[PDB]
Amino acid sequence: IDPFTPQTLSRGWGDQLIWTQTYEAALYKSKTSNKPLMIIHHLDECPHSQALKKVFAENKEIQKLAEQFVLLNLVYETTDKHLSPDGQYVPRIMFVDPSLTVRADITGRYSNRLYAYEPADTALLLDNMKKALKLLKTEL
Numbered sequence: 001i002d003p004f005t006p007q008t009l010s011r012g013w014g015d016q017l018i019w020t021q022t023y024e025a026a027l028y029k030s031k032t033s034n035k036p037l038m039i040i041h042h043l044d045e046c047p048h049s050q051a052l053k054k055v056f057a058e059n060k061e062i063q064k065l066a067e068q069f070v071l072l073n074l075v076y077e078t079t080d081k082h083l084s085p086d087g088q089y090v091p092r093i094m095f096v097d098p099s100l101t102v103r104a105d106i107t108g109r110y111s112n113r114l115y116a117y118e119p120a121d122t123a124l125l126l127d128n129m130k131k132a133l134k135l136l137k138t139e140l
Contacts, residue, residue, distance in 0.1 A: 018070055026072045027096060036098050037070035038133065041091035043078040046117065052092070055119045061126050065133060092117040093125055095132040106131050 007013075015033050018026045023039075030037035040056075042049035056062060079087040083094065092115075097103050106128060108114045114124065121128075 016067055018072060021073065023072060023074060026070055027100075030070045030096070031100060034098070035069065036133065036135075037072060037096045038066060038129070039072040039074065039094040039096060040066075041083060041094050042073065042075040043090050043117070044075055045078045046090055049075055049117070052117060052119055052122075055122050059122060059126070062122075062129060065129055068136075069133065089115060090117045092121055093128065093132065098135075103134075 013033075015029075015035065018029075020026075026039075027037055042052070078084075078090050083091065095102065108124065108128075111124060112120045115121070116124075
């Protein structure tokens with residue numbers, strides 16, 4: 001593509017994680033860097049996502065893929081009108097497809113419920129994170 005901004009002094013790409021908490025800015029720079037973003041959606045109204053956060057921050061697998069991608073940690077409204085207008089169940093993980101949209105093609109065997117926010121979904125979250133991410137670098 002055309003030269004956007006040359007690197008100098010320090011901070012080359014700054015594409016890791018996101019650093020700042022802003023839904024629109026996160027998704028925006030993701031598309032700008034042609035890199036998919038994974039929106040981690042929490043809630044305060046149920047068992048504090050801090051409990052889940054502990055195991056999340058403890059799971060190497062989840063961090064490894066997320067550090068190479070975007071993680072949009074949002075904690076506000078259990079059923080926000082943007083992701084859950086009609087209400088289905090509290091999320092845990094979400095993913096924005098390169099086409100700036102979402103793809104619900106995830107199916108599974110009945111391990112311990114296929115959709116939860118409780119630390120139980122941490123093993124699934126791993127395999128689900130892969131299916132949700134689908135393509136890593138287009139080539140692979």
